[PDB]
Each structure stands twice: as structure tokens, then as C-alpha cells.
Amino acid sequence: LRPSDKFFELLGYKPHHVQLAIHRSTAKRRVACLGRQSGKSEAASVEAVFELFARPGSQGWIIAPTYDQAEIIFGRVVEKVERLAEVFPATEVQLQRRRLRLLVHHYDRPVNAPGAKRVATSEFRGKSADRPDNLRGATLDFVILDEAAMIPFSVWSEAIEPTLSVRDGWALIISTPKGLNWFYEFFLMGWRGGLKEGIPNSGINQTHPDFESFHAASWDVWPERREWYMERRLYIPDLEFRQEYGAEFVSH
Numbered sequence: 001l002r003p004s005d006k007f008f009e010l011l012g013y014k015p016h017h018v019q020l021a022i023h024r025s026t027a028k029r030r031v032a033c034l035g036r037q038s039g040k041s042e043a044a045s046v047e048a049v050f051e052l053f054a055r056p057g058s059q060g061w062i063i064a065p066t067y068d069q070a071e072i073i074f075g076r077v078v079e080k081v082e083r084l085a086e087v088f089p090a091t092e093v094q095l096q097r098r099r100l101r102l103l104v105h106h107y108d109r110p111v112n113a114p115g116a117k118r119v120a121t122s123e124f125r126g127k128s129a130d131r132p133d134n135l136r137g138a139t140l141d142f143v144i145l146d147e148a149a150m151i152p153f154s155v156w157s158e159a160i161e162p163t164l165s166v167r168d169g170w171a172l173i174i175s176t177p178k179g180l181n182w183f184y185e186f187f188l189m190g191w192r193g194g195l196k197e198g199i200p201n202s203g204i205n206q207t208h209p210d211f212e213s214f215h216a217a218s219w220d221v222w223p224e225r226r227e228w229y230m231e232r233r234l235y236i237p238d239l240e241f242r243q244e245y246g247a248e249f250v251s252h
């Protein structure tokens with residue numbers, strides 16, 4: 001249910017402390033409010049790869065505000081899945097790049113052997129919030145929301161959450177913050193790190209047991225870049241800096 005160090009090693013993946021914390025969490029609602037360059041995309045892609053191989057027949061989506069944004073995590077899952085399939089002889093990968101559809105077929109024997117029968121198919125799709133029409137179906141075991149704070153809450157409440165609750169699927173909800181909107185609320189439901197600047201009501205907030213939240217500024221992950229980030233404030237508006245790098249929740 002959780003990818004292991006052995007699985008990371010297969011992926012050529014060496015997570016950072018914040019990525020590792022996300023991977024170790026068993027919460028069905030993981031909410032990561034992290035600045036740019038925090039490793040959000042890579043960690044989410046690793047989660048998807050693991051599900052497709054470790055849970056044959058699993059179905060998941062990555063949803064972003066736009067298709068170009070969804071292509072980022074989707075494309076990384078593709079590379080990893082097509083490479084990793086080499087060491088699982090009973091799998092065969094099928095890709096539809098145009099439709100952002102990735103299939104991992106699981107067989108009853110190695111694919112190169114006579115008589116191989118397909119037993120299960122894991123499926124991973126990219127989806128766009130700015131195309132609600134293509135949000136139909138589907139029984140999901142997992143979902144990734146990328147730049148979630150820019151996705152309308154209605155996409156979550158109406159088009160994603162109902163299908164997840166069916167199979168008791170999990171959600172990884174990741175974003176740089178965009179003020180005090182639904183992403184802030186979901187973040188607080190899982191925030192147990194106490195009072196922290198940039199997070200209103202931290203320290204006094206309630207939490208829900210199925211929620212776990214993660215927070216990191218860009219310079220928490222890249223301390224050697226802290227001075228460069230700070231020196232950009234000469235030409236970057238203060239709000240943009242506090243949100244995109246500080247990962248701060250600010251009342252617009």
C-alpha cells in the first residue's frame with residue numbers, strides 16, 4: 001500500500017524529506033502546500049507508478065487546471081511505467097498520448113510466453129479542470145490534483161470525491177497556495193505542525209483523521225537557494241513571492 005525503498009530504488013528515485021513524508025503517509029487525503037521546486041510532480045508520479053503495478057486493475061487520474069499542466073505528471077508517469085515494465089515480465093504497457101491514457105496490462109504469465117492471458121488492466125489518465133465535459137465516470141482508486149488551489153472546488157466536490165468514496169480511494173492534493181479557498185480548508189484539516197507564519201489558524205485548528213497535510217517553502221527543500229529566492233523580491237510582487245516560494249496562505 002506504500003511504495004518501499006526497494007521500489008524507489010527500482011525507479012531510480014531518491015526522495016527528499018518532504019517527498020518521503022508524503023510517501024510514508026497512509027492518509028486517504030494527503031494535502032501538500034509546497035512552493036515551486038519542492039518535488040511535488042515527481043512524488044505524485046511515483047505514487048501513480050506504484051499503484052499501477054502494485055495494485056493490478058487500479059484506476060487513477062491526475063487532474064490539473066489545464067491539459068498542458070496535466071501532461072507534466074502524466075508524462076513522467078509514462079516514462080517511469082514504460083521503463084519499470086521491463087522488470088515485470090507479466091506486464092505490457094499501452095499508451096495513447098493524444099488521449100492522455102496509459103494502460104498497464106497484467107497477464108497470468110510472462111508476456112513473451114505462449115498462451116499469455118490478460119488478467120487485469122491498470123489505467124491512468126490525465127484530465128483538465130478547464131474541460132469539465134471530459135470529466136465523466138469513473139470508479140477511481142486514486143487521484144492526484146495538481147495545482148489544486150487553481151481548480152474550482154466544484155470539480156472536487158461533484159466530479160472527483162463521489163467516485164473516490166466508492167472504492168475508498170485516496171487523493172493526493174498538491175498545490176502552491178492561492179489564498180483562503182477550498183485548498184486552504186483541506187490543508188488545515190490535516191495540519192498538525194502547530195502554529196506557523198503564513199498559515200492562518202494554524203496551532204488552533206481542528207483536524208480530521210483521514211487528512212494529513214505537508215508544508216514547505218521552496219527554500220525548505222532548497223536551503224542553498226534561499227538567498228536567491230529572497231533577492232528576487234526586488235522584481236517579484238510580495239504576494240507572488242510569499243505564495244509561490246513561501247507557500248503562504250494570504251488573504252487576497
Ligand SMILES: Nc1ncnc2c1ncn2[C@@H]1O[C@H](COP(=O)(O)OP(=O)(O)O)[C@@H](O)[C@H]1O
Binds near residue numbers: 039
Ligand atoms: N527526489 C528528487 N530527486 C531529484 N530531483 C527531484 C526530486 N524530486 C523532484 N525533483 C526535480 O524537480 C522536478 C519535479 O518536481 P517539481 O515540479 O520541481 O516540484 P514542484 O512540483 O514542487 O514544483 C524535476 O525537475 C525533478 O528533476
Ligand SMILES: [Mg+2]
Binds near residue numbers: 040041146147
Ligand atoms: Mg507541480
